[PDB]
Design a protein around this ligand. Structure first.
Ligand SMILES: Nc1nc2c([nH]c(=O)n2[C@H]2C[C@H](O)[C@@H](COP(=O)(O)OP(=O)(O)OP(=O)(O)O)O2)c(=O)[nH]1
Ligand SMILES: [Ca+2]
Ligand SMILES: [Ca+2]
Ligand SMILES: [Ca+2]
Ligand SMILES: [Cl-]
Ligand code: NA
Length: 328
DNA sequence: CGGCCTACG
DNA sequence: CGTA
DNA sequence: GCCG
């Protein structure tokens, strides 16, 4: 009754099993820190199944038949239901390894492989990194410089102000170009770690070269603290004005041709797990290859022409889910 | 047993 | 590798 | 870790 892929079922933002899902997500995160993407995926999928249930799980029995629940995930839920705590989860939480890998991977520009190397070298704190700036890329230096602000959740007021300044720069760069808010905010979240914008133009090809012109206009207005610079994606840090001051905010900008807009909108709206599951479903169940540019039939060697996200869902044989039900 | 999303910067 |  |  519970479909196996997250893209086959609605997942609302508010759900009924946060305690259980948070515990499984700890184990998922720790599996990633140890280099097991497969165990990460299973524990994420099991946590996501719980977010899709209509009611709180109160008894072991209620897991029977659910996909992605086997002996390990079931034992974790068992222990939480019976004792309010799972020893394995608590051991991970309080481990030096987990706490330090979380601290380091939370830096913009630092992933698991980098964090693990630094951990093996004996580094433990952000101060330790700042004292060895030779080990840092320019992206990491920016992430570390602005780490305090980047740890502060971005709210909706920040989004609306950011969208106004992005729209102004986009309109100055190319008349008729548009800006669409994507990411978690489009799914209905009230906070995020960054703001995501998708930029296009209704006339195919007019958007070529647009992102450098936007970035230059934002940089000239003093709004850019960091960006990597032809390009179509920018993972930036913006100097966002605040009353009497400013704060650093992570902003992602993507430019796509309008032919690709539905695919880019779907991909960048997420969630991360929802999109990996949708791409897996497409390839493994339907034989079609999905990305943020298109949906390819490798036997006909043709791309599906979609005018909306709904068209993509329909072509994949899936019930349509609005963004606020993609919170897998 | 092997697979596990995707590709741009 | 990073985005993640 | 779970599944095809
Ligand atoms: N984080 C992440 N996002 C991914 C991945 N693959 C993929 O297509 N995306 C898409 C879906 C996300 O909604 C979109 C933007 O990334 P994001 O981390 O800002 O996601 P979010 O807005 O839901 O998160 P947040 O700001 O609320 O923390 O990128 C991936 O592996 N990780
Ligand atoms: Ca990081
Ligand atoms: Ca975001
Ligand atoms: Ca983002
Ligand atoms: Cl694994
Ligand atoms: Na099972």
């Amino acid at each position: 009754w519970m479909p196996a892929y997250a893209c086959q079922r609605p997942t609302p933002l508010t759900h009924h099993n946060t305690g259980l899902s948070e515990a499984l997500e700890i184990l998922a995160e720790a599996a990633g820190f140890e280099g097991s993407e497969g165990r990460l995926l299973t524990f994420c999928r099991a946590a996501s199944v719980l977010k899709a249930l209509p009611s709180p799980v109160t008894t072991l029995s209620q897991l029977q038949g659910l996909p992605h629940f086997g002996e390990h995930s079931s034992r974790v839920v068992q222990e939480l239901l019976e004792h309010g705590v799972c020893e394995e989860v608590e051991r991970v939480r309080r481990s030096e390894r987990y706490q330090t890998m979380k601290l380091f991977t939370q830096i913009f520009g630092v992933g698991v492989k980098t964090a693990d190397r630094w951990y093996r070298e004996g580094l433990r704190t952000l101060d330790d990194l700042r004292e060895q700036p030779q080990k840092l890329t320019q992206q990491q230096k920016a992430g570390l410089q602005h780490h305090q602000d980047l740890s502060t959740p971005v709210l909706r007021s920040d989004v609306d102000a950011l969208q106004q300044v992005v729209e102004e720069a986009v309109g100055q760069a190319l008349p008729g170009a548009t800006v669409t808010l994507t990411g978690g905010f489009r799914r209905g979240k009230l906070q995020g770690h960054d703001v995501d914008f998708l930029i296009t133009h209704p006339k195919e090809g007019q958007e070529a070269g647009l992102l450098p012109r936007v970035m230059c206009r934002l940089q000239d207005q003093g709004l850019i603290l960091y960006h990597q610079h032809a390009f179509e994606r920018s993972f930036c840090i913006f100097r966002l004005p605040q009353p009497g001051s400013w704060k650093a905010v992570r902003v992602d900008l993507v430019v796509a041709p309008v032919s690709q807009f539905p695919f880019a909108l779907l991909g960048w709206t997420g969630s991360d797990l929802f999109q990996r599951e949708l791409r897996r479903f497409s390839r493994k169940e339907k034989g079609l290859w999905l990305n943020s540019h298109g949906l390819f039939d490798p036997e006909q060697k043709t791309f599906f022409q979609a005018a909306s996200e709904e068209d993509i869902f329909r072509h994949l044989g899936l019930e349509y889910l609005p963004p606020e039900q993609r919170n897998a």
